[PDB]
Amino acid sequence: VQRKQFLRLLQNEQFELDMEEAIQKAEENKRLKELQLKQEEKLAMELAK
Amino acid sequence: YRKEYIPFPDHRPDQISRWYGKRKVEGLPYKHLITHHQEPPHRYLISTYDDHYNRHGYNPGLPPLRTWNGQKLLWLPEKSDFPLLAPPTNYGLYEQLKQRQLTPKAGLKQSTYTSSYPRPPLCAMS
Amino acid sequence: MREIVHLQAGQCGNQIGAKFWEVISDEHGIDPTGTYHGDSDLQLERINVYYNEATGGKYVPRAVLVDLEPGTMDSVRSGPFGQIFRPDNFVFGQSGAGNNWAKGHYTEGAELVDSVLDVVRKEAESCDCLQGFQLTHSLGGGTGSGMGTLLISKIREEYPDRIMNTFSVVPSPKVSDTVVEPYNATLSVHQLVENTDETYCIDNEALYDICFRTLKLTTPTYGDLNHLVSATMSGVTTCLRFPGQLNADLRKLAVNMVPFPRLHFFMPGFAPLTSRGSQQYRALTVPELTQQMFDAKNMMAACDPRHGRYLTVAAVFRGRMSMKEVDEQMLNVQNKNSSYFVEWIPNNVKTAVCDIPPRGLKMSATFIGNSTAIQELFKRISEQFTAMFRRKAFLHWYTGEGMDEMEFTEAESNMNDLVSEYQQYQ
Amino acid sequence: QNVYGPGVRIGNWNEDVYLEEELMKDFLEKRDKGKLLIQRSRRLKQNLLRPMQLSVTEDGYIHYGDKVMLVNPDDPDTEADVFLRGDLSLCMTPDEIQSHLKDELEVPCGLSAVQAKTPIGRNTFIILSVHRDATGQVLRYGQDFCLGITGGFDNKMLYLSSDHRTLLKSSKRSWLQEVYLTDEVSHVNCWQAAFPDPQLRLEYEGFPVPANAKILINHCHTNRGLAAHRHLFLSTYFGKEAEVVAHTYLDSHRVEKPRNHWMLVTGNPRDASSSML
Amino acid sequence: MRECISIHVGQAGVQIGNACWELYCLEHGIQPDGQMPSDKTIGGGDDSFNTFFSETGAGKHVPRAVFVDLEPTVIDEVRTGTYRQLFHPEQLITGKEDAANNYARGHYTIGKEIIDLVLDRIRKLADQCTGLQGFLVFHSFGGGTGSGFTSLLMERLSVDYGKKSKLEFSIYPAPQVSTAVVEPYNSILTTHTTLEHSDCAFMVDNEAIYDICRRNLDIERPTYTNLNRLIGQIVSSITASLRFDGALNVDLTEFQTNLVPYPRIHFPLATYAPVISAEKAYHEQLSVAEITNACFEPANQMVKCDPRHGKYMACCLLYRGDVVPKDVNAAIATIKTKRTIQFVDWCPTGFKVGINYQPPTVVPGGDLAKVQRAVCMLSNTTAIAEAWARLDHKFDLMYAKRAFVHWYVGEGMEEGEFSEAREDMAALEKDYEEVGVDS
Ligand SMILES: Nc1nc2c(ncn2[C@@H]2O[C@H](COP(=O)(O)OP(=O)(O)OP(=O)(O)O)[C@@H](O)[C@H]2O)c(=O)[nH]1
Numbered sequence A: 001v002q003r004k005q006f007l008r009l010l011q012n013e014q015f016e017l018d019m020e021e022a023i024q025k026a027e028e029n030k031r032l033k034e035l036q037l038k039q040e041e042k043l044a045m046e047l048a049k
Numbered sequence B: 001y002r003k004e005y006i007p008f009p010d011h012r013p014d015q016i017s018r019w020y021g022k023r024k025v026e027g028l029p030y031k032h033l034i035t036h037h038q039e040p041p042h043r044y045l046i047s048t049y050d051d052h053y054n055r056h057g058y059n060p061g062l063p064p065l066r067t068w069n070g071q072k073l074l075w076l077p078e079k080s081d082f083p084l085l086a087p088p089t090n091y092g093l094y095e096q097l098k099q100r101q102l103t104p105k106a107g108l109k110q111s112t113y114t115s116s117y118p119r120p121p122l123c124a125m126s
Numbered sequence C: 001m002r003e004i005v006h007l008q009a010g011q012c013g014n015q016i017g018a019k020f021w022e023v024i025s026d027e028h029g030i031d032p033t034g035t036y037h038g039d040s041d042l043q044l045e046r047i048n049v050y051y052n053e054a055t056g057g058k059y060v061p062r063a064v065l066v067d068l069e070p071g072t073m074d075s076v077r078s079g080p081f082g083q084i085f086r087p088d089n090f091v092f093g094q095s096g097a098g099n100n101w102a103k104g105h106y107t108e109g110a111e112l113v114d115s116v117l118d119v120v121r122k123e124a125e126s127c128d129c130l131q132g133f134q135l136t137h138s139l140g141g142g143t144g145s146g147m148g149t150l151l152i153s154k155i156r157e158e159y160p161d162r163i164m165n166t167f168s169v170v171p172s173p174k175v176s177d178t179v180v181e182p183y184n185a186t187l188s189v190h191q192l193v194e195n196t197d198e199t200y201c202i203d204n205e206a207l208y209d210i211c212f213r214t215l216k217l218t219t220p221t222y223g224d225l226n227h228l229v230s231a232t233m234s235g236v237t238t239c240l241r242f243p244g245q246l247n248a249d250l251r252k253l254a255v256n257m258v259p260f261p262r263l264h265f266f267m268p269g270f271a272p273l274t275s276r277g278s279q280q281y282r283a284l285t286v287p288e289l290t291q292q293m294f295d296a297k298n299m300m301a302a303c304d305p306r307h308g309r310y311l312t313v314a315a316v317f318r319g320r321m322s323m324k325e326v327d328e329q330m331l332n333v334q335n336k337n338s339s340y341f342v343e344w345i346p347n348n349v350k351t352a353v354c355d356i357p358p359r360g361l362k363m364s365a366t367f368i369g370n371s372t373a374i375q376e377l378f379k380r381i382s383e384q385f386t387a388m389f390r391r392k393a394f395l396h397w398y399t400g401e402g403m404d405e406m407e408f409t410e411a412e413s414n415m416n417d418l419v420s421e422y423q424q425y426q
Numbered sequence D: 001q002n003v004y005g006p007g008v009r010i011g012n013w014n015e016d017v018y019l020e021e022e023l024m025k026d027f028l029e030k031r032d033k034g035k036l037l038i039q040r041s042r043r044l045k046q047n048l049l050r051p052m053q054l055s056v057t058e059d060g061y062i063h064y065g066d067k068v069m070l071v072n073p074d075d076p077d078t079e080a081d082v083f084l085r086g087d088l089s090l091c092m093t094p095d096e097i098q099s100h101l102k103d104e105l106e107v108p109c110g111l112s113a114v115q116a117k118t119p120i121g122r123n124t125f126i127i128l129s130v131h132r133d134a135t136g137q138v139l140r141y142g143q144d145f146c147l148g149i150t151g152g153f154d155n156k157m158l159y160l161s162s163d164h165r166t167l168l169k170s171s172k173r174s175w176l177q178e179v180y181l182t183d184e185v186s187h188v189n190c191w192q193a194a195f196p197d198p199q200l201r202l203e204y205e206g207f208p209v210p211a212n213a214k215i216l217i218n219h220c221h222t223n224r225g226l227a228a229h230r231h232l233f234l235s236t237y238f239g240k241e242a243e244v245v246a247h248t249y250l251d252s253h254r255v256e257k258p259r260n261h262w263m264l265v266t267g268n269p270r271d272a273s274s275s276m277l
Numbered sequence E: 001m002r003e004c005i006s007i008h009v010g011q012a013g014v015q016i017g018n019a020c021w022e023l024y025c026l027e028h029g030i031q032p033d034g035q036m037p038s039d040k041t042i043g044g045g046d047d048s049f050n051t052f053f054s055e056t057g058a059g060k061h062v063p064r065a066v067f068v069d070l071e072p073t074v075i076d077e078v079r080t081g082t083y084r085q086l087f088h089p090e091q092l093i094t095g096k097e098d099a100a101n102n103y104a105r106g107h108y109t110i111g112k113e114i115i116d117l118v119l120d121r122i123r124k125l126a127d128q129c130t131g132l133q134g135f136l137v138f139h140s141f142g143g144g145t146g147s148g149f150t151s152l153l154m155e156r157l158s159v160d161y162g163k164k165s166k167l168e169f170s171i172y173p174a175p176q177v178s179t180a181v182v183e184p185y186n187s188i189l190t191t192h193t194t195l196e197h198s199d200c201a202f203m204v205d206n207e208a209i210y211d212i213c214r215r216n217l218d219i220e221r222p223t224y225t226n227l228n229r230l231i232g233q234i235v236s237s238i239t240a241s242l243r244f245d246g247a248l249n250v251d252l253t254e255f256q257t258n259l260v261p262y263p264r265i266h267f268p269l270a271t272y273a274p275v276i277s278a279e280k281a282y283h284e285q286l287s288v289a290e291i292t293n294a295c296f297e298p299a300n301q302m303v304k305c306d307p308r309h310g311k312y313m314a315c316c317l318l319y320r321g322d323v324v325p326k327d328v329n330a331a332i333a334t335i336k337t338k339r340t341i342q343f344v345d346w347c348p349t350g351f352k353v354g355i356n357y358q359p360p361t362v363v364p365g366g367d368l369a370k371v372q373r374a375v376c377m378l379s380n381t382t383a384i385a386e387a388w389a390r391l392d393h394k395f396d397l398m399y400a401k402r403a404f405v406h407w408y409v410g411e412g413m414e415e416g417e418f419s420e421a422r423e424d425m426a427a428l429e430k431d432y433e434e435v436g437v438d439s
């Protein structure tokens, strides 16, 4: 019983960590996509000019 | 037997799907089942006797004189429709129980004679 | 002052009581440690009803925890409130009941009843003025229907002049999860009608219909059904522990619900239930609660109330509110639906008012209903019992352990006579 | 039928969208207010596992007021098949479940032995005199001294303590006398250092104790030696730890067993973060 | 705390016990050296292995099972294999000169010599059990040891231990393909004894698993290693409630209670679904309805009998993994309205449901795929009397000319029980008809 309660508490901590990672990854993806699009547009402008 | 039965020393067991199933069958809490209008729990603890007799019907928000509602019928400021959401009813019961329980009797070795017969004050002396 | 001793047995009864002690730990502001963390002083004015004081300001429940298998004792001690239960209250066996009533009532449930009877008699004389008893178990299992009906008979021999209340989990035809459940359900009902003052029948298919239709959930697991039941378990004694405008304890309910000694099978209901989309838009008013209590989609028992006549009806209200709208709405529903009530009892509605709503709600209302339509619940067990007993199927698990077949014979006779008493007043 | 999931607008999706938005809002409110379990555990671990600098001795004599580390040396014991290997360090251990539920440390706190070599905030002990006001003093054999641990906190001082056995007071797993930490000042915090060899013990009583040497630590009021149970395992928020008790162990020749041998470890002068080991 | 003692007798029991006991070591993460890996400092709270694995002061875990045979050809490969250090030196019992597919050698002459050595080892294994649920038996009908030595082992087990549960997993002869010539003689005699000395007899044959591995896993050329794993997957789903947690657990007495209506009928059928290759699971959606729809099809039966000819009596559904109790009720309710599935009149509620949270664990490099949910159905059907019909047709067609009888008379067995064992199941065939009569 004692170690089962310990496992339950550790699982709760793992749930919080999983939620934090799930909210960070979307921000990273949005930043990468925006940077790639802006760089592509600038390169097109320069070559055309 | 020797070809197929190999040690597999690759740390195979998985230990998280059981706990995910535990939480999935445990389900939603109070705040996501029954709690309404995102209300904090400190506000609605009140009683009719205290709100009507003890507090003398003190509601600063409501005007003293009722006015006609206009678009609807009837008189608008209703005391029974708008009760008081003040801090709740309190008196010395919590403090008395705290003093009776949380006191640890810091004098561990204390005879009945010494505890019952201290030096009396001169003010209470006659 | 007036103390309620809670009993729970089986796998189902252990998990309902686990969720039941969660809501009144919230309601009295009791932390999972065991201390008090609240604000109002009304919460400690009547706290000895459910919690016993210990040293250091620790409040522990007056509950008894019985099973023959340690499978669910490990879960209840590893829940959110696992530390709050006293370990001396846990009475566990060695081997499971195996979904057999003879195991739970004659052979394996016979040595374990002496250990429980020591525990309940130690807690009964701890109270100042014992109000009564409360029980929650399952008729479809081996431990709950086995020893739980054995314990019901034993306490009624010890303390006769009390009130005894149960919350039985009756079987269901569509959500039937055990082969041999007509045998264990029939034998418990024959023992229930003699030694019980109030019986609340709760059915699992009646609780799935609430979560699908009223609450709009996609995965309604047992943690929601055990918790909708737990709302009714606390709303029935809400005037015993809290002040109000019209108090009504457990005995005052049984006075106005039970006209004859065998008419004590109820249908419970809980009033304020709405989905998450419909939360912020629906206004909590007294007419909205009374519109929801009487609907057939809202009962916790799998019987349609429109196929019979409401013998007598109770309604326990909570929260700061008016009194004219309660008396008008309980009269308007009686005046319009005159064909749904008997004519030999006037004023079939009982009214009760508290002052503290359950936390997170503005007002609330619990429905306690004696009705003739609960005869339909016992017909679906009796038509399966005769269709099984005629071929003597699954019977050597019962006779071969010390049970004569005449315990099956009178289980037909009393159950069919009980439903025949319902036919006369319909 | 078939089910798709969160994003797809089919079936009963609106109530699921409401429920996930409510859950996300509640999670952000809780993590912004700071009631998050991982944040509390992070603060607790940051307080506990802080690096610390030890004292450095010149003449090899242990001084009062110096910061030392208690280390049980390793011996090839044949008592049990499984037991901790390598030198162990005496580290405090708070209660795990109460430590998760509440932020503040709960006195009394138990002790343990951990496979640790770098001095951290959990295993630095300061040798103190009960007479106090001791400057330029040498710790001597057979003399009373006390051990105080700050424990990664700059707030309070805690001392080792033990008492006579009682039917309500016992160790966690070995059922012997226990050793714990209290903030109270009494005579149950005093310990004595003695020579391991019983023949020369009284001859060496009253001599300045060497540093980084095997000595016996004996309590005064109960006269039990500090002992480390290697074969009994304690589960802890920081892994598996050996047990620690107060008991005197004797072989067939009445010589103290390697369980009772303890060594006080100072800091390396070349690198203060590392020890003499 | 609740512990099982498995018995493996014959060559079938050892070879099944090689693949069955590999899965328990690979489910709890117990290495072939006998010790759990040291990388478990964070992990804890695990004591579910005590049903089968006994601890030691050195941390070693040894199985609670006995391996019995009358030849050293099959056990010496275990003793010199990968798992030589794991099993006990004495829990692997060897005989001499086998039994040569003869029932009299297995029962009266050779199986009498070593029965006292095995009975000591069972008793030496039963005192450590602070709580023992019962016994599990793996053997074969068509063998000499698996049918001869088993027939008196169940007689000695019932005398020593009175009302303890006995559950069987037997290798029934397949209707078309088989190996031994005199298999009707051995199959008749051993099941005449064990009608009254057993409690539940799960059966599976060898042809119906050949059909499964062809049209599901796309294996054209399977061996017994491919077949033993699928039998080894059924045993885990049966026993998973005693090991791991769940919303509804079943003990070894609970699903014995809900599958035998009368004492003479204790013959279920074993089925398993979903079974699929590694590639095809990557695309097909596995709903709770689709894994219970596969169990009811006659093509997925693991015994070569069509259930459409007969009527079901009782059923047991045993779920694993991410199973919600909502979808169990809706999938069962669809089956209740099916006309193709027929039920007897006296069992209105035939379903017993158990759920465990552990998803099914699959051996690395195996033919079957890693899935999150699976169901094993132990269904009782009247259509197993078809299986007895084709074998008793085979028996009297060979007994008429007194073929092979002198192998049985000249060993120590009287010819008088050749007729009685045929007359025993003549009345048993009358019993399956009377049960299926609608009232
Ligand atoms: N499916 C399957 N069947 C097996 C396996 N091992 C043995 N059998 C069956 O066993 C039958 C032959 O009898 P055996 O088990 O080899 O030998 P026995 O039962 O010990 O009898 P004796 O050799 O006389 O001692 C074959 O018809 C197979 O069907 C196996 O690993 N998988």
Ligand SMILES: Nc1nc2c(ncn2[C@@H]2O[C@H](COP(=O)(O)OP(=O)(O)O)[C@@H](O)[C@H]2O)c(=O)[nH]1
Binding pocket: C009, C010, C011, C012, C015, C016, C097, C099, C138, C140, C141, C142, C143, C144, C145, C169, C176, C177, C178, C204, C222, C225, C226
């Ligand atoms: N509502 C609800 N029903 C439950 C719960 N646990 C079990 N049941 C029901 O109870 C029946 C089985 O009861 P059982 O465990 O055999 O009772 P026991 O033998 O006394 O422990 C199943 O059909 C379930 O539907 C629960 O936590 N909540």
Ligand SMILES: [Mg+2]
Binding pocket: E010, E011, E070, E071, E098, E099, E100, E143, E144, E145
């Ligand atoms: Mg053989």
